Ligand binder design. Structure first.
Ligand code: 5VH
Ligand code: 5VH
Ligand code: NAG
Ligand code: NAG
Ligand code: NAG
Ligand code: NAG
Ligand code: NAG
Ligand code: NAG
Ligand code: NAG
Ligand code: NAG
Ligand code: NAG
Ligand code: NAG
Ligand code: NAG
Ligand code: NAG
Ligand code: NAG
Lengths: 335, 336
């Protein structure tokens, strides 16, 4: 429960901003696979009370703040203009490390969520490679489970608390603004999707006995949370998910209800410059998007869900601390 | 003829050896590569005399050469020793692209079997993502046929030519050495396997008029070919298929005569140190297996067969060029 610090492999000649922040504000990693394996001790974890997240969070905020400068930043009727220079942008892995004395407890093996008991435990100094991908609804470029899909929540019996669904077979998603220049779109292969929501539905049913399971879009709110919003090559993509998070889990099987066509599902995307910042409760304005093909080839690795004779589930997000929690669940700082 | 170049999503921060090699041997892939479809054409392909295969072969040889360094390398009477560190091993997709002045022809006839005429043709810059998986008998993590199973051979009536069966439904296989530190095992669901060999049995029952079609284990030879040999996380697995390739397809129906248990076929595996190199003629000796659970969860996407009243088929392999052919059958390098 003390001051941690980051390590990475960020070359110092790279103009890309995450490297520029890293080099100046981090450390080159270590090739010491220091892994004090153990398997007695059955310790308690809690991925929701865990200061590593707040630590990381207010560092991603720093990163973003130093890096992506909006033309305008409004907050409390207070405008603050500056330069809007387009930059080079791509998540590099960060490792969070503890200084002496004493470091990081890590839970091992397969099906083990974020709360409570766990047996096989190792002790480490730093953590695995983590991209600080800022996104809603869908988790991108993240890790996988080495077995079966697993469900995470501070409380599933609470319709208010975000459900982090951790997958194990990633779903390819491809976003494009071709060569109306804030009109974009995203492709997602339909079978992998139906299959995914099938499995996730199956294990959702294992936590909600004999209820029909309905996947249905978000109720409403800001475009950041009611769509799959994310950053790509500096540009802020807001991607539709009406015909993605609609589908029915019935009888023991799942069937989709989203318009497909000869294989892939297409989502309508809008690039925007006015954004409601995830860092604080203000809003930022950037310059019009760069010209040319604006494309991102990304890996869907997790879901953010929100629950309402049927149980309804809608995509969540908003809070990036959750996005960090999705992978900082494993660990716990100790003496 | 040209000198292709590889392309991948290799991470420079990744210490997994395929990434390490690909980062310095290949180019970053294009996030979105576009086909150019062609009506009007009809071109001939021959998966069995393709140079792309040899090029890829060489590349994977170099890759394995730089990556997996054996403690000992023996070739006849001459032996070489060097450092043999345990590494992180997990294949990544490799694209093969033609340089400027050339292009890659791609057949989209999804019943096309590598040899002969192909009508629906497209041109591309780079191939699809191909994981250079080295294995025998079973082809792992390949692309699936898009409709009915496909039988491939340079020559079917020649029992000396290896037959490549392209499945269209992957058969999950799970190999594991649990917590004897060299004894491991694989698990396969029997139902999927029986459906598989049923349909494969049919597709073979076509090409060979009306004969009892038997599936039997490899008659003999080196363990690398008499067993399902493959690499899991740098460790060389030799898995037993006496209970897998074991059955009879007769007049419409398949019968699995191989031992099973609770619907599961379990292969008995052995992690070896002494291997017969596939790259060249000679033996390689590696260090004892690492500690902890060594598990690989893979998908069977193809089969390698050799044919002998009744027709008998046995698991083949050994020439990894076929393993590349299994994926590179669609493609043809051309100058324009
Ligand atoms: C309140 N709520 C969900 C929720 C929880 C926490 C936060 C928010 C929302 C607000 N989040 C964001 O503004 C936000 O994430 N913006 C944002 C910025 C960049 C990217 Cl790529 C992105 F995906 C989202 C943040 C507050 N920000 C501000 N409004 N302008 C933090 C619901 N009622 N569902
Ligand atoms: C000759 N033959 C089949 C055949 C064909 C070609 C080749 C071979 C065998 C030899 N192949 C191999 O040694 C080989 O593939 N080894 C090998 C290494 C690693 C893995 Cl994972 C593997 F599956 C096999 C190679 C020659 N190597 C050498 N013996 N030491 C290449 C039959 N009579 N059935
Ligand atoms: C291990 C793997 O690759 N995929 C698994 C699949 O086998 C399993 O049926 C499903 C149910 O949780 O979870 C996922
Ligand atoms: C609603 C909820 O979060 N329940 C969890 C349960 O999933 C978990 O198994 C247990 C300890 O393992 O702690 C509690
Ligand atoms: C999940 C948790 O830690 N505490 C409570 C749980 O005991 C209670 O059942 C639920 C609603 O009944 O609200 C929450
Ligand atoms: C918050 C938001 O953008 N919601 C829209 C929804 O109203 C619309 O029906 C759907 C498809 O048109 O796209 C999305
Ligand atoms: C958004 C919602 O709740 N349901 C939609 C439905 O209106 C639409 O007809 C269908 C076709 O893709 O997709 C789902
Ligand atoms: C959302 C996101 O960051 N996606 C990234 C993409 O930007 C990057 O180009 C690719 C590999 O370079 O990996 C993924
Ligand atoms: C083993 C096999 O099926 N071989 C066939 C061959 O007989 C046929 O002439 C050719 C035509 O495309 O397709 C292939
Ligand atoms: C397309 C599909 O789902 N399954 C096919 C099956 O229809 C076909 O009979 C078989 C070839 O014998 O290949 C597989
Ligand atoms: C086109 C071709 O090569 N056909 C051959 C044939 O000449 C040979 O008699 C037979 C037996 O080996 O195998 C096949
Ligand atoms: C090449 C090889 O190992 N073949 C073995 C064989 O000797 C043995 O009789 C059988 C049953 O254990 O399993 C297989
Ligand atoms: C290889 C063959 O032709 N038949 C085998 C037989 O040898 C073996 O005893 C039995 C049990 O595994 O499975 C079958
Ligand atoms: C034709 C055939 O082999 N069918 C079998 C079936 O009888 C068995 O229940 C299942 C699991 O062992 O595997 C398959
Ligand atoms: C022999 C082999 O290639 N096994 C791999 C396995 O290690 C990996 O976990 C899986 C998913 O990428 O694909 C397969």
């Amino acid at each position: 429960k003390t001051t941690l610090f980051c390590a990475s492999d960020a070359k110092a000649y790279e103009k890309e901003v995450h490297n520029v922040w890293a080099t100046h504000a981090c450390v080159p990693t270590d090739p010491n696979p220091q892994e004090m394996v153990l398997a007695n001790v059955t310790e308690n974890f809690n991925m929701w009370k865990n200061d590593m997240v707040e630590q990381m969070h207010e560092d991603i905020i720093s990163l973003w703040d130093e890096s992506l400068k909006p033309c305008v930043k409004l907050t409390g009727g207070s405008a603050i203009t500056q330069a809007c220079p387009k930059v080079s942008f791509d998540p590099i892995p960060l490792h969070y490390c503890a200084p002496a004395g004493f470091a990081i407890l890590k839970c091992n093996n397969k099906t083990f969520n974020g709360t409570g008991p766990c047996r096989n435990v190792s002790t480490v100094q730093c953590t695995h490679g983590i991209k600080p991908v800022v996104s809603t609804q869908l988790l991108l470029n993240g890790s996988l489970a080495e077995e079966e899909i697993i469900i995470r929540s501070e409380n599933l019996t609470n319709n208010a608390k975000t459900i982090i669904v951790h997958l194990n077979e990633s779903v390819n998603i491809v976003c494009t603004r071709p060569n109306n220049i804030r009109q974009a779109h995203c492709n997602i292969n339909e079978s992998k999707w139906n299959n995914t929501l099938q499995k996730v539905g199956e294990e959702l049913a294992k936590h909600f006995p004999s209820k029909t399971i309905k996947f249905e879009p978000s109720s409403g709110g800001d475009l950041e949370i009611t769509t799959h919003s994310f950053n790509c090559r500096g540009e802020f993509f807001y991607c539709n998910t009406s015909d993605l998070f609609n589908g029915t889990y019935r009888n023991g099987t799942y069937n989709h209800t989203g318009r497909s066509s000869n294989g892939t599902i297409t989502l309508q995307c809008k690039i925007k410059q006015i954004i409601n910042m995830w860092q604080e409760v203000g809003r930022a304005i950037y310059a019009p998007p760069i010209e040319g093909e604006i494309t991102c080839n990304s890996n869907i690795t997790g879901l953010l869900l929100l629950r309402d004779d049927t149980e309804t589930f809608r995509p969540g997000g908003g809070d990036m601390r959750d996005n960090w929690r999705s992978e900082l669940y494993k660990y716990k700082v100790v003496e």
